[PDB]
Structure formats: C-alpha cells, structure tokens
Amino acid sequence: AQTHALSNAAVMDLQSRWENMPSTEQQDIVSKLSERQKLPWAQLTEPEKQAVWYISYGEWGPRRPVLNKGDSSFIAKGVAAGLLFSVGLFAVVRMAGGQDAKTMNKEWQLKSDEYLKSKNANPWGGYSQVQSK
Amino acid sequence: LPPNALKPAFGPPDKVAAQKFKESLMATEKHAKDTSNMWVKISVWVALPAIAL
Amino acid sequence: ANKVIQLQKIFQSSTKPLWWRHPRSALYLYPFYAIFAVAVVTPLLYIPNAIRGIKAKKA
Amino acid sequence: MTHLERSRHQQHPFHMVMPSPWPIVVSFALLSLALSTALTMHGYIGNMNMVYLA
Amino acid sequence: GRIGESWVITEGRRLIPEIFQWSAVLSVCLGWPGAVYFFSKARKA
Amino acid sequence: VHFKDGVYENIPFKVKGRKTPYALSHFGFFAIGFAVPFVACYVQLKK
Amino acid sequence: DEETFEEFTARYEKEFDEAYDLFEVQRVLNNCFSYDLVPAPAVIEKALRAARRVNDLPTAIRVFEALKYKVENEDQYKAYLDELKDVRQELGVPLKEELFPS
Amino acid sequence: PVVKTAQNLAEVNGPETLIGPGAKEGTVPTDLDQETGLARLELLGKLEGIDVFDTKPLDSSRKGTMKDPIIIESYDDYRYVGCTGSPAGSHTIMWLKPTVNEVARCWECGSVYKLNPVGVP
Amino acid sequence: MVQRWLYSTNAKDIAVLYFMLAIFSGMAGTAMSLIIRLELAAPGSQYLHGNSQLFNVLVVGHAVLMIFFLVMPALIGGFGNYLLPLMIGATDTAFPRINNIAFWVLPMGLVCLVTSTLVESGAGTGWTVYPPLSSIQAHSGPSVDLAIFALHLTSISSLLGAINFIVTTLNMRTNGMTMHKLPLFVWSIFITAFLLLLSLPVLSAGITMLLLDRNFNTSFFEVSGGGDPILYEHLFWFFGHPEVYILIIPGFGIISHVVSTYSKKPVFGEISMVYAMASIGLLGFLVWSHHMYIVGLDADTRAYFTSATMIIAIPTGIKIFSWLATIHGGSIRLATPMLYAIAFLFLFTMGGLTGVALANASLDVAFHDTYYVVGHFHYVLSMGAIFSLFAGYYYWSPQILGLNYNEKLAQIQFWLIFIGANVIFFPMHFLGINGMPRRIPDYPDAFAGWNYVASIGSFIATLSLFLFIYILYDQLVNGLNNKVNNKSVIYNKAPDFVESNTIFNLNTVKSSSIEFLLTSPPAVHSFNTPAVQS
Ligand code: HEA
Ligand code: HEA
Numbered sequence A: 001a002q003t004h005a006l007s008n009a010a011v012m013d014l015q016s017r018w019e020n021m022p023s024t025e026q027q028d029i030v031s032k033l034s035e036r037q038k039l040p041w042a043q044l045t046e047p048e049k050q051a052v053w054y055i056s057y058g059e060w061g062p063r064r065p066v067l068n069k070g071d072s073s074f075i076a077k078g079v080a081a082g083l084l085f086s087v088g089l090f091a092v093v094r095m096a097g098g099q100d101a102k103t104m105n106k107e108w109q110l111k112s113d114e115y116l117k118s119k120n121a122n123p124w125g126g127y128s129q130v131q132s133k
Numbered sequence B: 001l002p003p004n005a006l007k008p009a010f011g012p013p014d015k016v017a018a019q020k021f022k023e024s025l026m027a028t029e030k031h032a033k034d035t036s037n038m039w040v041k042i043s044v045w046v047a048l049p050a051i052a053l
Numbered sequence C: 001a002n003k004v005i006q007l008q009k010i011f012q013s014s015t016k017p018l019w020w021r022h023p024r025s026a027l028y029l030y031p032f033y034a035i036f037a038v039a040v041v042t043p044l045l046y047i048p049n050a051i052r053g054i055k056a057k058k059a
Numbered sequence D: 001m002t003h004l005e006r007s008r009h010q011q012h013p014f015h016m017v018m019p020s021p022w023p024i025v026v027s028f029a030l031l032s033l034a035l036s037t038a039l040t041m042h043g044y045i046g047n048m049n050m051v052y053l054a
Numbered sequence E: 001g002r003i004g005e006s007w008v009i010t011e012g013r014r015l016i017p018e019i020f021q022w023s024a025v026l027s028v029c030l031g032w033p034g035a036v037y038f039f040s041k042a043r044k045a
Numbered sequence F: 001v002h003f004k005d006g007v008y009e010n011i012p013f014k015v016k017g018r019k020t021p022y023a024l025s026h027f028g029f030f031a032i033g034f035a036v037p038f039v040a041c042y043v044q045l046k047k
Numbered sequence G: 001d002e003e004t005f006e007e008f009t010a011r012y013e014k015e016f017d018e019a020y021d022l023f024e025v026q027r028v029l030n031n032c033f034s035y036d037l038v039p040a041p042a043v044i045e046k047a048l049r050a051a052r053r054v055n056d057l058p059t060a061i062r063v064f065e066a067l068k069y070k071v072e073n074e075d076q077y078k079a080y081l082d083e084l085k086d087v088r089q090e091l092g093v094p095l096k097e098e099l100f101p102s
Numbered sequence H: 001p002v003v004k005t006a007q008n009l010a011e012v013n014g015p016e017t018l019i020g021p022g023a024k025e026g027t028v029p030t031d032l033d034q035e036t037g038l039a040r041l042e043l044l045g046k047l048e049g050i051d052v053f054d055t056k057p058l059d060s061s062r063k064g065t066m067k068d069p070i071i072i073e074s075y076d077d078y079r080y081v082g083c084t085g086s087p088a089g090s091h092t093i094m095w096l097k098p099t100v101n102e103v104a105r106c107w108e109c110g111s112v113y114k115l116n117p118v119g120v121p
Numbered sequence I: 001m002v003q004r005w006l007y008s009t010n011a012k013d014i015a016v017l018y019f020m021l022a023i024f025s026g027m028a029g030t031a032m033s034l035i036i037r038l039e040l041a042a043p044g045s046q047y048l049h050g051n052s053q054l055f056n057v058l059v060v061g062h063a064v065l066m067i068f069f070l071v072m073p074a075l076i077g078g079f080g081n082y083l084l085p086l087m088i089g090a091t092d093t094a095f096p097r098i099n100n101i102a103f104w105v106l107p108m109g110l111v112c113l114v115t116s117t118l119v120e121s122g123a124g125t126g127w128t129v130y131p132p133l134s135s136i137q138a139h140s141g142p143s144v145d146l147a148i149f150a151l152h153l154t155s156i157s158s159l160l161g162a163i164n165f166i167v168t169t170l171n172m173r174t175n176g177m178t179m180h181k182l183p184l185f186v187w188s189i190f191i192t193a194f195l196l197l198l199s200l201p202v203l204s205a206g207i208t209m210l211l212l213d214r215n216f217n218t219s220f221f222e223v224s225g226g227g228d229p230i231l232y233e234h235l236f237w238f239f240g241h242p243e244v245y246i247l248i249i250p251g252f253g254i255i256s257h258v259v260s261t262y263s264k265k266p267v268f269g270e271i272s273m274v275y276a277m278a279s280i281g282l283l284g285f286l287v288w289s290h291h292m293y294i295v296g297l298d299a300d301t302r303a304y305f306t307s308a309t310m311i312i313a314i315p316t317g318i319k320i321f322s323w324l325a326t327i328h329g330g331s332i333r334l335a336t337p338m339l340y341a342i343a344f345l346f347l348f349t350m351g352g353l354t355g356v357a358l359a360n361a362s363l364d365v366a367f368h369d370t371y372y373v374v375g376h377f378h379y380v381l382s383m384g385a386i387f388s389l390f391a392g393y394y395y396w397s398p399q400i401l402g403l404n405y406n407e408k409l410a411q412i413q414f415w416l417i418f419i420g421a422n423v424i425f426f427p428m429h430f431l432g433i434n435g436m437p438r439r440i441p442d443y444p445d446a447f448a449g450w451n452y453v454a455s456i457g458s459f460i461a462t463l464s465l466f467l468f469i470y471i472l473y474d475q476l477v478n479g480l481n482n483k484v485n486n487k488s489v490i491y492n493k494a495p496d497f498v499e500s501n502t503i504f505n506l507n508t509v510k511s512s513s514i515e516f517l518l519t520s521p522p523a524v525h526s527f528n529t530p531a532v533q534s
C-alpha cells in the first residue's frame, strides 16, 4: 500500500547481514523497495539507499570473489604443510634406504684434486669436488 | 495417410530447387557416361595398340 | 528378391539381437574363444612362475 | 506424427546399436594373436597349429 | 587542459615499485640456487 | 540408454551399498596403479 | 582509430530514447564503457534521465562510480568534477555523499 | 508385408517398412523408389521440391523487441538459438537458451528471443 | 555394468572411460618415474643393486606410457569425443563402434608391457627402437614383440579416433556453424587429425619391416645384409616430430578457449590464429631430418633444416603474441585454470625459446642426447599435457559431470605441482650444458646435489598428485555439500561491474561454447533438434 519511511529492523538487518536472514523475506523487502522507487525519490533516507545499494552492487554470491574472507591463510598453511610432509617423507625413505658408496669422502676428493693439480686440469675453475662428507 | 496435427514437416515450398537437383543428377550421369565412352574410344583407338606393342 | 521384404518385416516386428542371420555360427564361436585364448594365456604366466624370483643381488 | 519422427531420426544416421561385443572380441583376438606369436617365434612352446587357428 | 599529468609523475611513481618488485622476484628466483650453493659444503664451510 | 537421470551414472561407482563406501574401490585403485612399478622392481631385484 | 564520436553518440541517445526497462539501458551502458571512448556529459545526462525513467538509483550509483574510475586519463579530476556536478545539480540524485562515509 | 510405392512423403509409416523394389536384369531402375534407408525422404523431396536440414539463418536484421519477438520453430522443450547482430557477423558469436515458459535475451545484442513449439497433447 | 559399460556404443559413456584410463596410467607412471628418480638420487646402487637392464626397461616404460598411453587418450580421445560432438550439436558421432574399438584395443598393450618387464628379457633399448639394438643380436625374448604390438595397437586406435573426428567435423556439422566461424579447439583437433593421418603410416610400415627383419631372418636396415639404420631413423624422426605437435595443438586450442572465456572478451583475430595452427601443421613436415644433425650431412642440408626450424618458430611466437593481446585490456579473475594458462604461457614459452636456440645446425655438438634435451622436452610436455589436462578438468568438470571441486585445494595443488615441476626440470639444463650423457643408471660424482634437488622435487610432485587424487575423491563424494556452501565457486563468470546481481539470475553462464549453456548432463542421445545460428 506504498508504505512511507520504512524505518524498521529490516533495513538495519539488510545492511548488517543479508545472506544470514533466511532468503524468504527477501522478496517482500525488495518488492517494498521497488514500490517506493516507483514514486519519485524525494530524498531517500540513509538506510534505504544503503540497502538498495547493497542489494544491487554485490559483495555476496555472484559478486563473491574466488578469494574468500581469508582462505588465503588456509592456502599458505596447506602449502607449508605439503612441503614439510614431502621433505619429511623423502628424508625418512632415504634414511631407510641408506648409503653404500665408497666415495664422496674427503680423502677421495683430496686425492682427486691433488692429481688434478699434478696434471693441471681446469686451472681457471674449481679444483674442489667434494659435495658431501 | 499418417496423421499430422499441424504440419507434416513441410519445410521449404516446392521451389525451383527440384528441377535444379534433377538437372544436376542428369548432368552428372551424362558426364559419367560421356567420359566413359570417350575413354573407351581413345583406348581402343590409340592406347590399346600402344599397350599391345 | 522374394524374401527381402518379408524378412525385413519380420525383423521389424521382432526387434531382437543377433540379427537372426547366423545364430548357429554365433553359438559355435562364443565358447571357442573362452576355451582357446584363456587356456593359451594361462601358461604364459604359469610356466615362468618357477623362473620368476631371480634377484641377482650383488655386494 | 511425421514431422516429429522425421526430426528425431533425420540428423541421427546412427542406429540404437545393441550391446555389440565386436570391440571386446576383436581386441581379445588381437591380444591372443600377439602374445601367441611372441611366445611361438621365441619362447617356451613352438606350437604352430593353434596359433594358425587363432 | 592537461590536468595533473605530466605523464612522468604517476608513470614513475607507479612503475618504479613494480619494477623493483619484479627485480626482487627475479633476484630471489636466481638466488635460491645461490642459496643452495652457499648452504651446501661447496667450499668445505 | 535414455533410462539414466544424468547424475552419477557417468561413473562406474555406486554410493548405495555397504560393500564399498568409495574407500575399498579407491584403495583398490591405488593398489592396481602401484602394482606395475613395485612388481617390476621386485621381479628382478629388491624394492 | 579514426572513428567518429557523433555516430555512436547519437546511437546511444536513440537507444536510451526507447528505454522500456533496465535491460537495454544496462547493455548500452556496458557497450559505452567497453570502448576507450570516455562518455560525454550529454550521454551521461541521457543515461541518468533513462535511469530516472526506469527508477533505479543504484544504477546511477554504479555509473557514477564508473565515471569516477573507468580509465586513468592521466588522472584527470576537474573534468570529472564538472561532469559530475552538472548532472548532480541538473535535477538532483543525491547518492555519492553516503556510500563513501560508510 | 509387400513392397510400397511411397510416391508421396505423406503416406509412409515406418522408416524400415519401405525397401525399394528393383530390377534383376534389363535396364537400371529409376532413382525414385528403389533406395534402402531413409535416404528417400530427402532425395524424393528434393526431386519434388522439399529440402532437409535447412541452413537458412533466422531474422538477424530484426532486433526482436517485446512487441514482435522473433519466432523459432522447435517442438522440443529447449532450444539453442541466438543472434549475431543485424548483419551476418557483427559481434561475438553467441546463442541463447530459450525455454517453453519464460524467455531469454541476447545480452549485449539485446535481441529478445522466444521459443515457439508446435502444439502437443 | 557389463551390459552398458563394457558393451557401450556411446561417446558420452566412453569419454569418462578414457578419462579413468588416462588418470590411472598417469598415476602409475608418476609412481614408476618416482622409482626411477629415487634410484638415481645418489651415485651407486642406492636402490637398484645391479641389473641396469631393469633401469633401462623402467625408462622405456616411463617414456612409452607418458607419450602414447597417458596423454593420447586424454586430450585427443577423451576430450575430443566429449567436446567436438557436443559443440557441433549433433546427437551422436558417426559410427561410435570406431570409438569403442579404439578404446578397447589399449589394455592388452598395458598387460604386454607389464609381462615384458616381468620376464628377464625386457625392452631396454630406450623408447626409440633404433636397430640393431632391438633385434635378436642384443635383446632377445618376446619383450620387443610385445612393445611393437602395443605401439601398433595405439597407432590403430589413434587412426580410428582421427577417422571419427574427421568424419564428424566434415560430414554432419551443424547448419549454424560454417568455415569462417568455426571455433578454435575443433580446428586444432582437425589439424591434429591431418597430421596424425599423414604421420602414422610411416611408423607403421617401418616398424613392420623391423619386425619382419627380426622374424624372417633378414635385415633391411641392419648391417647384416648391407642395410643402414640411418634410413629407419629418418623414418622414425619423420613420424616423431609431428607427434609433439599432435600432443601440443589441442592444448593450444583449449588454452585459447580458456583465456578467451576468462578475459571476458572475444578472440583476437581467430582467422590469424587458425592460419597459424594450419601453417604449423603444414610446416611440421619440412624438418624430417632436423633431429639428426649428428651424422654430418651436407652443409646445405643443415642450413635448409635450420632455416625450416626458424621459419617454424615464427607462428608460435605470433600465436603467443595473440594470447598476450587476448589477456591485455580485459578483466581478470584469478581462477585456477587461468593460473594453469599463465604457467603455460611462461614456462612453455621459455622451453620453446630454449629449443629454438638449440635448433641451430651446429649446436647439437654440445646438447644432443644429453640432459639439455630432456630438460627441453620435459618443459613442453609438462606445460602442454599435464597443466593443460589440469586446466581442462578444472574448467569443464563442474558441468560435464555436475560435480564441483574445492577451490582452496585446487589452488594449493597448482602451487605445489608448479613449484615441484620447476625445481625438477630447471637443474636438468645445468646438467645438459656440462655435457653429461643420458640413459645411464650410474653417473660420475660431479652433479650429485642437482640429482638430490630433483629427487626432493619429485617427492613434492608425487605428494601433489596424491593431493590431486584426494581432491578427485572429495569431489566425487562431497559435491552436493560443496555446491551449497562457500567451499567452491559456483559461477566462473562474475557479473560485469555495471549490472545488478538480480538480473544476473537469467545470465548465469554465457560464453562462446554451447555445452556451457546446457543443463545437467542429459541422456546420451540428446540434441533432438540441431542448433541453428542466425
Ligand atoms: C607426459 C610426458 C612426461 C611426464 C609427465 C614426465 C614426468 C617426469 N619425467 Fe620424464 N620422460 C618423458 C616424458 C614425460 N616425463 C619422455 C617422452 C622421455 C623419453 C625417454 C628418453 O629420453 O629416453 C622421458 C624420460 C625421462 C628421463 C630420462 C631418464 C634417463 O636418462 O634414462 C628422466 C630422468 O632424468 C625423466 C624425469 C621425469 C620426472 C622427474 C617427472 C616428474 O614430473 C614426475 C612427476 C609428475 C608430474 C609432476 C606430472 C604429473 C603427471 C600426471 C600424469 C598428472 C596426472 C593427471 C593428469 C594427467 C590429468 N623423464
Ligand atoms: C610437447 C612436445 C614438444 C614441443 C611443443 C616441442 C617444441 C619445439 N622443439 Fe622439441 N623435442 C621434444 C618435444 C617437443 N618439442 C622431444 C620429446 C624431443 C626429443 C628429445 C629426445 O630425443 O630425447 C625434442 C627435441 C628437440 C630438438 C633436438 C634435441 C634432441 O632431442 O636432441 C630441437 C632442436 O632442433 C627441438 C626444438 C623445438 C622447437 C624450436 C620448438 C618450438 O616449436 C617451440 C614453440 C614455441 C616457441 C618457438 C615460442 C615462440 C617464440 C617466440 C616468442 C618468437 C621468438 C623467435 C622468433 C624470432 C620466431 N626439439
């Protein structure tokens, strides 16, 4: 019946949390808002303009971005956990396998670089090839 | 005569496309027959004696 | 010929598989594959069962 | 009646083909032939008649 | 009426942070192998 | 072929049935996948 | 690329002339903002008049925000100031002084 | 049960009910009623002036407003038809999803479409 | 399930079978390459005590399954038969028995490879089958014959798939679609069909003569009789070079589609890009012997081949500029398929330019048959196959099956697999530039740390794949619960920032692909009346 100055709990509820209220009074409130909008503006009050802007602009549903309200923190935590799990699994499997190599030890590398100096190989480079204990 | 409530898939009317398609079919058949006869004639004329030689 | 239209009508009336053309041949060929191929592929892995297990571990 | 059936079978030149076992049987035949030839040319059994039957 | 820019002001103030950030990104992406080389006993250190 | 709703028939799975809560089949998929590498390693050598 | 503004401008006013509802208004507004062509104050006034005809002030809020930030335009301001004040005080659609301090 | 002449396309019931009588020896039968399959439905039609699978585009020139929305004939519940502007190719290739109850619009083209199916029981 | 699945004749019901086979093969191959990398972490027999033939057979299986058994059924077969007939609007593809026989001819290839690896003989001649190493002189046993039959059946399946694609595209295309407005992915798959058609017979014949040489006590290419294997290696390279384009071009099509839809703008001169792919496909045959600079052919031939390679490089750069213009000046939503596309356009481009540098006639003296070439092709294989498959899955999965996926899980998965792939494949170029050999279970003690970092990256990648299969499980089990809540995005298209959300209810999913305008997957024989474009 073209109610005037709809100053009730509905407008503050709409501006505070829209998705929370159970998607049933939405039709009634938008119908009332449009019915008011049929008549000339006559300087709409703050809650009504805020409500229609909130309904029409977004920040909900379709306008909700792929990035949520802080799930990037979850993404970072998950990727950190994934790296930690991968490195731990590789460490434990390599420990289980063990090492059975008779080189990479210091004496082999020192003898190798001694022979390299004797034969004068790679003078303008790195004579040290150890890479391990 | 099967029933049809509104239309029996009439589609486009009987335009000049019917005789165009008939002419295309007869032209294709005549072309095939003519090329077969001409190839047979040129084969029996020159190609077959050359092949035999 | 004198049997094409009648056979087509019978096939349309009786929408059944096997196409009605070679039922005896199908019944002859169905068990042959199971009898032959399975019994010839079982040795392929049955015989090397004792052969399998060559670790060839060296230290 | 004619229009609906013409539209439903016109652009559909593919029959409602039954559960035809042709692909599985032909694949089975090729695999049997391949493994039989591999086992016969160089393997444990030099049988020739049954691979010919395959 | 050429209000404000004078392209140079906003141009520099906007690209300089971006080019610095990209240079830092490339420096990290080239120094992580360098970080591995430093951390590993490359010189028995 | 027109008797399927178009929801879960596109996968050879079945929610209904206590034989497998999509866990026995998923573990079996891991098993059949990890068969070839480990058996290939094991047949001529150790894991 | 050597394209006249007058033809597309007149197309815009002609489209807004028969604005039965908000759908064609929205599509034509999106098309106008699709080009690099910065809308003239005349087409903006025509768009606001059509929005008044279809009675949706939030559409006016959206278009005002778009005019405020559509392209850098070397960060021109006084052009935006006049292009907003003329259409604010031509008839009166008070919307900008509310969403900003909220 | 027996051969059917099927001279007219409005007297054939059952696609497989017609095979097409032929000739064993003598002269070749004419390509009118001797074809196996639904090929006769198109070949005899195009012999008499009936085409199959029309490629004629809809009224691209008409904008299809609410007063006179364009009409597409499709007895199915749904349809996949759209607009490409007034000329052949003007804007991005696009199509709509018309339905029996409500309507759809071409967005940037603004061409309102409507689904018009034939009457069904 | 046998009555409808094992005996299917539907492209709709066979695309999912293709996908399942592809994912199973991919996960098995990743585990097996995990084994390969793990035994190569340090010099010595850390995990493979002797039997280098076993390592060689493992390498052959890895390469063969990656090339012919994993990616070919996925984007060529699996994506083609579920996208091309759907985009056309035809109810069903022509003669689906071709698709069924192409599908069912795969698995015995897998069983023959597994039983060939099981026996002591094995196929340890590399994925290449260059003679006489694959003949009875060196490698005996049925393993070679089993691998030959496996490649033959894969080739037959690929040929049948190309047959179906060609006939569907050319004979029963919808009236609305024409030559001048045909989309990009179907053009890509059609050009790939041309290349596959013109490439399969040479491999078929050459490998048939190799089998005949192994059997008939003869030798056409082996020296035992006067033959030369160089001719067969020309034939094999003539087949192989179009193969990478075959596996990369549908990737180009899908990447073009996803960037065009995610930029909210149309394509940038579709005629130019389709000309680019056509030129690539036509020019792929001019470098038949560009991979074999090592012999020492005439300088004019080498110059001609390097000129052909530098000519081939141009359309790829033009197409890259085309994507760059497509993404330029458009709205951007940072959704995961866009992340895959960006990773592609970066790393694939870097790999391709490195290959262009390598394409020099005289530069094979330091890089050919080394770790540099493996670092080269691993780049492009990962970008155009792995990431392209991930993008296609995360881009059509919500509609082709109706089941959504966790966006957070997708993001973490992309990050993990991207960093793993980078840290795996980057050091391989440093190994190659030194001049290290290839296909050796044991290596000198110079580049141990690079092998260790490759191993840890491989573990990261396999953990990422485990997370990915868990994501598949979660999507298959909790799609309904994920749709209702905010765990995933239900509209890949956010409304334009001029329009209200209430009008958006009628504007849910609008793009340039028909299957997106479809509802939940209907019955197989859908599309009662073909679509018409005005
Ligand atoms: C699909 C192509 C593909 C893929 C994914 C891979 C994956 C990997 N490859 Fe391989 N490789 C080849 C194609 C591929 N490779 C080819 C053709 C050869 C030739 C053999 C030769 O040169 O002689 C080869 C050879 C080859 C060698 C040569 C070994 C030797 O010299 O003998 C090495 C080792 O250096 C190696 C390493 C790796 C590693 C660490 C991965 C890791 O990335 C593994 C971890 C996996 C990934 C990070 C990708 C995920 C894979 C999937 C399947 C995802 C599943 C889901 C979908 C598919 C949707 N590869
Ligand atoms: C996905 C598969 C794939 C793809 C897409 C490619 C793409 C390319 N490849 Fe590669 N290649 C392989 C897979 C692939 N390759 C495999 C498996 C081998 C065998 C390894 C083995 O034998 O073990 C191989 C081997 C190989 C060799 C020989 C190395 C060897 O194996 O010993 C060479 C060099 O001639 C080469 C070059 C190229 C080039 C120039 C491209 C280009 O087409 C890349 C296209 C992209 C670009 C070129 C980017 C566009 C560039 C610009 C932005 C313009 C800049 C340049 C100009 C001015 C035009 N490839």
Ligand SMILES: CCCCCCCCCCCCCCCC(=O)OC[C@H](COP(=O)([O-])OCC[N+](C)(C)C)OC(=O)CCCCCCCCCCCCCCC
Residues within 6 Å of the ligand: A070, A072, A073, A076, E028, E032, E035
């Ligand atoms: C050699 C390997 C090194 C490895 C070093 C690893 C460092 C640790 C990981 C850092 C990864 C950076 C991205 C983190 C993910 C993320 O959420 O980024 C966005 C956040 C935004 O903030 P938020 O995390 O959402 O929290 C908001 C809190 N409110 C708003 C309520 C006050 O914004 C931020 O997180 C800050 C902005 C990101 C700037 C990136 C550039 C780099 C400089 C960062 C400087 C601060 C952080 C580092 C300090 C030591």
Ligand SMILES: [Cu+2]
Residues within 6 Å of the ligand: I241, I287, I290, I291
């Ligand atoms: Cu090549």
